[PDB]
């Protein structure tokens with residue numbers, strides 16, 4: 001038996017997704033990158049309780065498979081599929097160490113790569129994703145912006161309190177907590193843009209593109225003036241699409 005970090009977070013992550021200001025921007029940006037899923041087979045990596053895979057199934061995907069390292073999160077994911085009677089299937093795997101489970105039209109990986117604890121493990125994850133993709137498929141990912149700096153402002157008001165920033169091999173490691181009750185602590189890794197693009201190339205993707213989060217006028221209208229300045233000038237998050 002082996003502990004995963006989210007085994008102690010569990011239901012609090014869903015609490016975070018319902019209150020954090022940044023979540024609506026993440027969801028909007030991710031589905032903008034995904035586009036139409038009708039008929040597609042989908043692999044949702046670091047699936048948590050299964051949000052993205054389940055919404056992708058709700059938008060008309062064919063087969064949807066979810067993978068997460070946390071037995072606790074997979075247990076919550078399976079209970080949601082049981083409650084809504086949907087066909088999602090889930091597996092407990094460490095993505096840096098797993099075998100491919102099939103060839104998919106779409107791999108969705110929201111908040112996977114920032115949990116690679118070395119550039120070596122980053123590279124392994126991308127290789128695994130490439131081995132899971134049909135030749136005309138694509139990877140849609142959401143991860144930490146390599147250029148985020150804690151000196152330029154915390155993200156706590158958007159839902160993620162970043163507690164510190166430490167050099168960690170060629171990148172950085174951050175301790176943090178989701179703004180929940182009580183707050184739920186976790187750690188994540190900020191690898192450089194160069195290491196990401198090298199991991200993508202060496203895994204056999206010919207195309208990648210970074211995607212700035214889709215913050216919109218209606219988001220700005222409904223918060224006090226300047227609320228989104230740190231989000232715009234020191235963004236913690238970024239989108240990423242890769243194609244074989």
Ligand SMILES: Nc1ncnc2c1ncn2[C@@H]1O[C@H](CSCC[C@H](N)C(=O)O)[C@@H](O)[C@H]1O
Pocket residue numbers: 004005006013045046047048049050051052067068069070073093094095096109110111112115116
């Ligand atoms: N190496 C790894 N392999 C697979 N899952 C991992 C992982 N490291 C962390 N995770 C999982 O990644 C998740 C981050 S939470 C993100 C959940 C979901 N994608 C959403 O946005 O709704 C946690 O469930 C955690 O257990």
Ligand SMILES: Cn1ncnc2c(=O)n(C)c(=O)nc1-2
Pocket residue numbers: 111114144160187188236237
């Ligand atoms: C899982 N998850 N969900 C939302 N937001 C984040 C996030 O900002 N960071 C930095 C992170 O490591 N993990 C997140």
